[PDB]
Design a protein around this nucleic acid. Structure first.
Ligand SMILES: [Mg+2]
Ligand SMILES: [Mg+2]
Ligand SMILES: [Mg+2]
Ligand SMILES: [Mg+2]
Ligand SMILES: [Mg+2]
Ligand SMILES: [Mg+2]
Ligand SMILES: [Mg+2]
Ligand SMILES: [Mg+2]
Ligand SMILES: [Mg+2]
Ligand SMILES: [Mg+2]
Lengths: 131, 156, 190
RNA sequence: GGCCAGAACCAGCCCUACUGCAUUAUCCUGUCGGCCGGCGGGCAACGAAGUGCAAGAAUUUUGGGUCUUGGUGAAUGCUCCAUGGCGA
RNA sequence: UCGAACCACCUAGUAGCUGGUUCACAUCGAAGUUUCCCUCAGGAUAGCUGGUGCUAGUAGAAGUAUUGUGCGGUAAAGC
RNA sequence: UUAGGGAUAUGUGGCGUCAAAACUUAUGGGCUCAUUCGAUACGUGAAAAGGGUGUUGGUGGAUAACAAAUCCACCGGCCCCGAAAAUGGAUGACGCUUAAGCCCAAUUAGUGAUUGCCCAUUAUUCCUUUGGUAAGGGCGGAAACUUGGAGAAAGUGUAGCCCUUCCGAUGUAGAUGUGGCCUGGAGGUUAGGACGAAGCUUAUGGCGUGAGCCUAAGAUGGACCGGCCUCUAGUGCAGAUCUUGGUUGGCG
RNA sequence: GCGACGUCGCUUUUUGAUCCUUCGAUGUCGGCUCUUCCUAACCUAGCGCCGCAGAAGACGCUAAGGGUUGGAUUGUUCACCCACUGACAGGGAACGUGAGCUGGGUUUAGACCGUCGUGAGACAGGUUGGUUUUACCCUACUUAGCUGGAAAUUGCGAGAA
RNA sequence: UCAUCGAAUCGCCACCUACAAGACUGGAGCUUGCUCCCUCGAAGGCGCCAAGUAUAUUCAU
């Protein structure tokens, strides 16, 4: 029912004719599809690694399984962009069931109050909170 | 064209749900005790509420014997019953949902009233065209016999 | 955005009895009685027992839903207090030359030769707010309002100060007017 | 003849059940307390889905001539012969 | 009738200007651009377009990429 | 992006009424009250700083005391003012505000993997036309239960030689084709007519996509004339302040 | 109350552009007359506020509701004075308003003058004299009648404040 | 001159929908309003067609 599943996308940089064994990059992104995961996989590597989607290959994107469906806390360090105060990060600790669920509320909250939508939004540290 | 529940019988009323809800503070109504869901694909089941997560949303479950999973059902179709297990006066939200329900609080309610109406309206949906005759000779009987009793009252 | 803070409570002693019927409040005592209305968002007034506790819970909350709860707390205590203790309202004046007269006739108030205006300035007062003068000699100036209700005698001990101003004129150099004086909670043990 | 209704094969849109089919991790235990850290073996997959095979059977619509026939046991082959039902 | 009368004639004077130009269906189907013109309300010439074609034509094909291989000095940059 | 129809499905745009579609979605996440809210791009731009002691969001840095919590500074709007004209007045109208507004999502409801739903000259499929000179196959006598054709003729063109197959199909100026339409007349042929020709009338049908043709019936007409192949031209009219004739409105 | 320095929004009875509409004709300014509209308030109207004691002004806000003159010179708009007034505010309506008037200015054909030109003539320089057609049509308005009408002329169609 | 379209009907509707009394004694009743659906009520008993398979109900105010 909550959209925006959680994808585990990993990939080298088409090895290599120069380096012959480029370091593998893996990161987990929330996305509606996996085409949208790879689209934002090759945005981190184009920026945080200077690697094109052309000059590299996706090793194994994957759908993370779940957590036993039970309520718990979540602080989601989220970073959006807007003409509304360009590139501000946030914390916005939510209380939903799964990481997919809470990050959904994260997006539907920023697009609600900052009108920042999916591609203007990076995510980091979707972790939980005991108390 | 109006279906009726009187008074003030209602135009244009869909026969697949109602806007029942009147807003109430969450904590008073419910606390991991027991509840039933009106509008679900599984229809009119009762599951004791495992916990409250955020505001409207609840986690609703039931031990077994009902094909009811542990799941996230929203208060918009989940309405409290006063057959609680762990809400309110009783000291804590309990665990071991089967054992707490092995206090027959569900078994008592499933054989008490307001559950004889749940399957009543679910009987009038599975009544084939033969029991609908049975129901009509049953009302017609109680009907005129009611008139006979009225005649007796007139005599008295 | 939205949260919950606390709950509001008032104790109801002997000599004061509060109802809850039609979600409205009735407070009576041994010096006066008064009833009024206190509706607002998420503000459902329910009195637990007849003389135990006036509780007003709200389930939602924000700056506006919570800046409206404890004003009924400011407006339920003075129901219970006014029916036993009551708050008196006093009014004074000043003069330099104009010798004056004033009047009160049963249910109305007169103001004659105000600043030189030789006519009457009427004003209606509700059923049960009785007042006299001490123009005779010892005080000579004051109008002392008595009663029971916080805002049903404050409402008219507000207009006599609206019935006063001198408009196209320097105001500070001279003080024409019998104006409301010294907001005060007068109690008594005499 | 025109007006209908029903039926039957053709293809077509299809009703779709069960969904199997593999994978992947989910998850199986241990003693701890109202700030939580002291971890390991996959041997379980009915709420794992970026994923493979299904007709008999549901529907109006549209067109109707070179047919149909009988099953065998293996590791699918011999084959034979020449529309009806109303109303007007 | 007069900043050149009136009648008839040359005379149906000329007009790069204005108005109009009579049936159907079918098959296709544009241009306002080039150069030249006392040229810029027009022409001529190419282009566009139609018809008829001729001819051995998966080629002497391409508003496309690839591969190599040249070219360039705008953006950004730098003073 | 466009031949004539039917169906299936979409596009853009939408689904409170007008208005087909959520008969007001079991909608979900927040936002929003706005004394001219706000609400489809491009229409032209809507509103510019500025602040606050305002409603919601975020970061720097205290106290454990404000008058068991309470601060000192700003980032971010939704929103308040800043801001105004002249017929009455516009989201398109009503209207909506615990939305029918805004931003995100959804699509049968956390039960289990698809198309929520409505609209086209689009798409798919089905017929029908028509062109391509597009491919084929027959291009003179045989049978599937009832008729049609794998027997209708060696053919650009039709009432196609016959089937069936593919594909395309808009269009101003323009070009071109038509076994194509029509008027006057000629050379041929075939043929009508006082038992009623031309003409004329039309709720006279039919049939050709059309130009048009043919029929009927005239309480019309009275004496000429149709089809076909060639020939021929003073050959088709709604529109030229057309020309001529006649009528008409305004108009008793 | 504004003024250095400055700037930044919105302004047309604005200075000009633009060449989009009009060349088989949207008839030229100003008035007269009459109606309307706006507020950026001139007057009255409402408090407000000051070194606003009375007096009397002073600043301000709210309000388009009502009111806003008569003359002299000018064709004028504007301007200027005269005088009244509570004050004589500023605008739109095709620079409101000629099938309404006027015809003073633009205004051609006559004529004179100034400068210019060899001359014919030119001047957006001056001066004088110089057409002002048509509603009998449709609507608008204004009054004046008549008659139908509830499935707003129809079904029998059925709804009584 | 009518042949019609229409197709539940009210002394149980139809002040009120909601009171009164539970952070644990139930209240409910100011009610899923009745009744209607093939012989006035459930147990029978009874005639029906040829109106010859659908065709506006060949009914009914
Ligand atoms: Mg540069
Ligand atoms: Mg359709
Ligand atoms: Mg919402
Ligand atoms: Mg001739
Ligand atoms: Mg001619
Ligand atoms: Mg003619
Ligand atoms: Mg004409
Ligand atoms: Mg004029
Ligand atoms: Mg005068
Ligand atoms: Mg008229």
């Amino acid at each position: 029912k909550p959209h925006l599943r959680h994808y585990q996308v990993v990939g080298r940089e088409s090895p290599s004719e120069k380096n012959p064994e480029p370091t593998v990059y893996k990161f987990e992104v929330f996305a509606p599809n996996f085409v949208v995961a790879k689209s934002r996989f090759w945005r981190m590597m184009r920026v945080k690694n200077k690697v094109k989607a052309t000059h590299g290959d996706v090793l194994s994107c994957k759908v993370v399984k779940d957590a036993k469906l039970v309520a718990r806390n979540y602080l989601v360090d989220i970073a959006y962009y807007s003409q509304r105060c360009g590139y501000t990060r946030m914390v916005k600790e939510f209380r939903d069931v799964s990481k997919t669920g809470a990050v959904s509320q994260a997006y539907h909250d920023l697009a609600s109050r900052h009108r920042a939508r999916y591609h203007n939004i990076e995510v980091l540290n979707v972790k939980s909170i005991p108390d | 064209t109006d279906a009726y529940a009187v008074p003030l019988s209602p135009l244009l009323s869909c026969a697949q749900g109602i806007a029942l809800c009147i807003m109430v503070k969450s904590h008073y109504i419910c606390a991991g005790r027991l509840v039933r869901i009106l509008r679900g694909p599984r229809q009119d089941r009762v599951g004791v509420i495992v916990d409250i997560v955020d505001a409207n949303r609840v986690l609703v479950e039931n031990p077994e014997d009902a094909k009811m999973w542990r799941h996230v059902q929203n208060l918009k179709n989940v309405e409290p019953l006063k057959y609680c297990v762990s809400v309110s006066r009783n000291c804590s939200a309990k665990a071991l949902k089967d054992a707490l329900a092995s206090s027959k609080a569900l078994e008592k309610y499933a054989k008490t009233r307001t559950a004889a109406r749940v399957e009543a309206k679910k009987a009038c949906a599975a009544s084939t065209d033969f029991e609908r005759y049975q129901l009509r000779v049953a009302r017609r009987s109680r009907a005129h016999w009611a008139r006979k009793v009225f005649d007796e009252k007139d005599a008295k | 955005m939205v949260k919950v803070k606390s709950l509001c409570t008032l104790q109801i002693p002997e000599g004061v009895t509060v109802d809850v019927k039609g979600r409205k409040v009735t407070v009576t005592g041994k010096r006066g009685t008064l009833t009024k209305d206190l509706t607002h968002l998420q503000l459902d007034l329910r009195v637990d027992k007849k003389n135990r506790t006036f509780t007003v819970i709200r389930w939602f909350g924000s700056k506006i839903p919570i800046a409206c709860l404890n004003t009924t707390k400011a407006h339920v205590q003075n129901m219970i207090t006014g029916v036993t203790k009551g708050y008196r309202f006093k009014v004074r004046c000043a003069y330099a030359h104009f010798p004056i007269n004033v009047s009160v006739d049963g249910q109305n108030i007169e103001v004659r030769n105000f600043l030189g205006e030789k006519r009457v300035r009427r004003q209606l007062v509700p059923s049960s707010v009785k007042v006299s003068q001490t123009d005779p000699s010892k005080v000579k100036d004051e109008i002392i309002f008595d009663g029971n209700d916080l805002e049903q005698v404050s409402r008219e001990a507000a207009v006599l100060h609206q019935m006063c101003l001198v408009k196209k004129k320097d105001i500070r150099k001279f003080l024409d007017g019998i104006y409301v004086q010294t907001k005060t909670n007068i109690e008594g043990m005499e």
